[PDB]
Design a protein around this ligand. Structure first.
Ligand SMILES: [Cl-]
Ligand SMILES: [Cl-]
Ligand SMILES: [Cl-]
Ligand SMILES: [Cl-]
Ligand SMILES: [Cl-]
Lengths: 155, 155
């Protein structure tokens, strides 16, 4: 069932993952699935980390990530980054399962309460900060966004 | 008036600035003063930025920072970073006033509503993250702390 459509306008703020996922996430959620072909660059690896921080801060014990393995220069940090996130989650009693596919195109987030969130840009919807010390560098509610569509579904 | 003493134990979590300053910061606060000799290094400048993000997200219009200039070459990066924070604040309609003193030793945060918060380590009370991609790297509520005392005062 298609439940809602949220339009994130160009340069819009108030879209941290905490703000965006709020309505669909509650204490009953114990398992999460994320399909995103673009978790390779530093900022994309940190976006996934912040998504995991939100889920554990909330009773998630299992996170599944389906992504594409980087073929080039990003491969080393992508591997080191994803293994570090998995080890940090393990230390929190959380299982992270990473699967790779070069044939993935869909961007989909699924919670075991039945909610599904499809973002056009996946988790990678923020613009680069104006500077190294600009407001919104750390608090993503103050970070301007790229124009994107968020589609909400329920099982 | 000395109001309360909060002991931050070694390796304690749940101490982001948002969590720590919650009880003393409300819609009525329009002006903030911070005295901290250690707003020099990249991590200390980011600490100050996250403190400003919290105040701006509340109707704070004026922020005063009294700090110490680093004695060495690090002063170039501290001065540049502080100017970047001031320009980002300016763009948000917020005035940041930075003053430097080689004779300041006290750590004191003052809100216009009468509340005063003195942290032993100032804003710089977090431990280094376990790894580059560990939970708590971005969300400070998951970041382990150094042992410190927080003293609360009211005018
Ligand atoms: Cl976020
Ligand atoms: Cl970023
Ligand atoms: Cl913080
Ligand atoms: Cl009060
Ligand atoms: Cl840090």
């Amino acid at each position: 069932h298609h439940m809602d459509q949220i339009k994130i306008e160009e340069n819009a703020t108030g879209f941290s993952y905490e703000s965006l996922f709020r309505e669909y996430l509650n204490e009953t959620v114990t398992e999460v699935w994320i399909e995103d072909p673009y978790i390779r660059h530093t900022h994309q690896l940190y976006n996934f980390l912040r998504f995991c921080e939100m889920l554990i801060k909330c009773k998630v014990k299992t996170i599944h990530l389906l992504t594409s393995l980087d073929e080039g220069i990003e491969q080393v940090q992508q591997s080191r980054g994803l293994q570090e996130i998995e080890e940090s989650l393990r230390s929190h009693g959380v299982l992270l399962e990473v699967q790779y596919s070069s044939s993935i195109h869909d961007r989909e987030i699924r919670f075991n309460n039945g909610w599904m969130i499809k973002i056009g840009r996946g988790l990678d919807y923020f613009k680069k900060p104006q500077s190294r010390f600009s407001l919104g560098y750390c608090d993503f509610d103050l970070r301007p966004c790229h124009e994107t569509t968020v589609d909400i579904f329920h099982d």
